[PDB]
Amino acid sequence: KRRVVVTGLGMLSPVGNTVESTWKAVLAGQSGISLIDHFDTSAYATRFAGLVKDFNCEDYISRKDARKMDAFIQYGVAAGMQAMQDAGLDITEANASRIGAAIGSGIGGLGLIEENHTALVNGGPRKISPFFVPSTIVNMIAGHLTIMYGLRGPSISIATACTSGVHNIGHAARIIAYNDADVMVAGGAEKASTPLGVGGFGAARALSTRNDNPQAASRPWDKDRDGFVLGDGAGMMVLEEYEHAKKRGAKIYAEVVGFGMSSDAYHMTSPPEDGSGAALAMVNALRDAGITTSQIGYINAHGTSTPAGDKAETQAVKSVFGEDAYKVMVSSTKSMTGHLLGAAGAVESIFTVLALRDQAIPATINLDNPDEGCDLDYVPHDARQVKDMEYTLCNSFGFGGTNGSLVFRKV
Amino acid sequence: KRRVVVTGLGMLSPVGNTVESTWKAVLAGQSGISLIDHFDTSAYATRFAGLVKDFNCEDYISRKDARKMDAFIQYGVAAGMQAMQDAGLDITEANASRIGAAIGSGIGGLGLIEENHTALVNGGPRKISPFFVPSTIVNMIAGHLTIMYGLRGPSISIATACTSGVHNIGHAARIIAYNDADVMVAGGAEKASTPLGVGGFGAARALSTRNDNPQAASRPWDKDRDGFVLGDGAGMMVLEEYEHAKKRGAKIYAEVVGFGMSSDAYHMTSPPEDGSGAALAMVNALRDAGITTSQIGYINAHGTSTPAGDKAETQAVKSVFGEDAYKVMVSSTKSMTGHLLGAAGAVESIFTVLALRDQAIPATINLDNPDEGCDLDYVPHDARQVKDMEYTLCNSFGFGGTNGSLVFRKV
Incomplete structure (x- = not known):
């Protein structure tokens, strides 16, 4: 291979x-x-x-x-x-x-x-x-x-x-x-x-x-x-x-x-509450990597700051990782850059690569108040420094119910 | 496999x-x-x-x-x-x-x-x-x-x-x-x-x-x-x-x-006079098939009716098939349909598949007078009927100099 x-x-x-x-x-x-x-x-x-x-x-x-x-x-x-x-x-x-x-x-x-x-x-x-x-x-x-x-x-x-x-x-x-x-x-x-x-x-x-x-x-x-x-x-x-x-x-x-892919088959613009399609994509990316949920240090989430969307992704992360979820850090850099659309998945995939190199995870700015069912570690305000981290997960979930995820490995 | x-x-x-x-x-x-x-x-x-x-x-x-x-x-x-x-x-x-x-x-x-x-x-x-x-x-x-x-x-x-x-x-x-x-x-x-x-x-x-x-x-x-x-x-x-x-x-x-891919790396809209980008794509599709030039019966050419483009494709077919260039039949259905852009490769690939099913090859209408540097069998006026054809090639050579070719097999 x-x-x-x-x-x-x-x-x-x-x-x-x-x-x-x-x-x-x-x-x-x-x-x-x-x-x-x-x-x-x-x-x-x-x-x-x-x-x-x-x-x-x-x-x-x-x-x-x-x-x-x-x-x-x-x-x-x-x-x-x-x-x-x-x-x-x-x-x-x-x-x-x-x-x-x-x-x-x-x-x-x-x-x-x-x-x-x-x-x-x-x-x-x-x-x-x-x-x-x-x-x-x-x-x-x-x-x-x-x-x-x-x-x-x-x-x-x-x-x-x-x-x-x-x-x-x-x-x-x-x-x-x-x-x-x-x-x-x-x-x-x-x-x-x-x-x-x-x-x-x-x-x-x-x-x-x-x-x-x-x-x-x-x-x-x-x-x-x-x-x-x-x-x-x-x-x-x-x-x-x-x-x-x-x-x-x-x-x-x-x-x-x-590299894992899926589709929501639900609605053209809004995601499912469950987040089945997003979850499906990550499971596939993980299978492609030959890797378990507990080997992932950081998830660059889609994290678009939309009501329905942000809830769906968390629920999808919990579904996939079970309760490695709270041990794993999940941040969206879109709090800073905004949503780049077609360039979003590319720019954010670079952060996941640099994160491995520098062993530093970007924060989710403006997270002053957690939402109802959002309990995961979103790296709330300041960049952490973590060590001996080796796998990153980059997510993007686009209009049309298109989902995709990449797994990078430290080398 | x-x-x-x-x-x-x-x-x-x-x-x-x-x-x-x-x-x-x-x-x-x-x-x-x-x-x-x-x-x-x-x-x-x-x-x-x-x-x-x-x-x-x-x-x-x-x-x-x-x-x-x-x-x-x-x-x-x-x-x-x-x-x-x-x-x-x-x-x-x-x-x-x-x-x-x-x-x-x-x-x-x-x-x-x-x-x-x-x-x-x-x-x-x-x-x-x-x-x-x-x-x-x-x-x-x-x-x-x-x-x-x-x-x-x-x-x-x-x-x-x-x-x-x-x-x-x-x-x-x-x-x-x-x-x-x-x-x-x-x-x-x-x-x-x-x-x-x-x-x-x-x-x-x-x-x-x-x-x-x-x-x-x-x-x-x-x-x-x-x-x-x-x-x-x-x-x-x-x-x-x-x-x-x-x-x-x-x-x-x-x-x-x-399935073969390549790019011209020459000009934004006009193709080179060879052949070379189109040739690469056909060669790669051939390699992908594990197949020789003498095993393909029909080529659904790009054939858009453009001065430069038509001459380029012919020259590309010459360089790849060599002695079988003249044994092979080459028609564009765009003579009747016109150029459908992003649907061109799709609609024509169906023609290449149907050709295998029915062992019939469409003609390229309005071929009243072949150009000077055109010596290939273009199926000039009427649909031909053929037998024993097992392989077809479908070509598409689009703007940005991006080329592609698919190989289909009768089975």
């Missing part, structure tokens, strides 16, 4: 423009939630979001090109480039066929779709950009990155809303484990903080409305949560077959040991 | 609302290209497309549900049911965890994004539909289907533009072969005949402009081809593990034996 490892990281988040800066901010509990100011939020019930600050795409992409790609692709490409240099692979003609990509997104280029539509409405079809389609569709990040680095291996893009990042990472490992690839760039990127994005989620009343204290709005498992907080960003991993990485002597962050 | 077979078919296309009706029209060489009507095409250079005709979604799903769906989700769901009904699956509780879905789309619900955006512009974020997000994002076809039939297994949605159909089917087989599921519903759906969709491809100058003779416009490998014709529809397959299929006495259409 071919073992798969993480040999390169890159990311853009609301609390940092690099991996390490974001990780520092995460451990120190700094919030990335700000007020939106790039469009008039007068009529909107929600006026804040987790935004990427001081991002200049001209470090990564010339502006001539950056005009041919929606912001979510710009993030994705940037984060991909970070991971590539972090990996330090040599791309040769004998290598190319064996290096590919698995990068997705939940919503994609909403921003550039809005632009082009207004242009169409105002000026007709001839005011539509000739690069409309390549700038907006979900798989164009991998499109840009493969071409940039001359990667000619398998290239896919899984779009499963909030489960994108996890699914992409997971299936990238499957592709490598199947011998179809030796190296994969995997992850997700998102920028749904647009008029339609904020408006759309607002119309569904899935958004928090605590405009008076934005950085306290995201409060998973707290009593006064009123919906999730929207966030932008991109997370990217370089996955590699294990012997291949050592033979070239790469820095090896962690091992991808388990 | 787990073998994967096809136990169910369902589809919606420009030439039929069922599989057998579509198949009939394809063998009879009927065109599905019509002039567009659901918006004013006065200012558009291209005013025709392959449209699904006489489709009523209330045949399949109630109008309240119908209301919360973009057209591409409606098509996908309808075809999903057809496949499930054809499969004759007994969904019990234990069974349920072992059945999932892998259904994608290249562009998704562009139509309803236009509608809600126009509403927003006219009335503000409070006139956005509360079902905006669940009605537009790509992975909601699998979402509805899982809920409908109580499927709790793995659920993904690969969004790789024109290659979506093939990647979804292929990875559905991988999931089954890896043992993460026993049954998988797979395929793609597309509805890009919208003002922004036709305008977007029109802006890129990739579309045909033969408005005077719409049904002769799609003419792959002809000398006077002037771009692809956009098409709509949805194709779906129920994939299943061989032992599981026989034990229940299933209708077995064929075997999924090979």
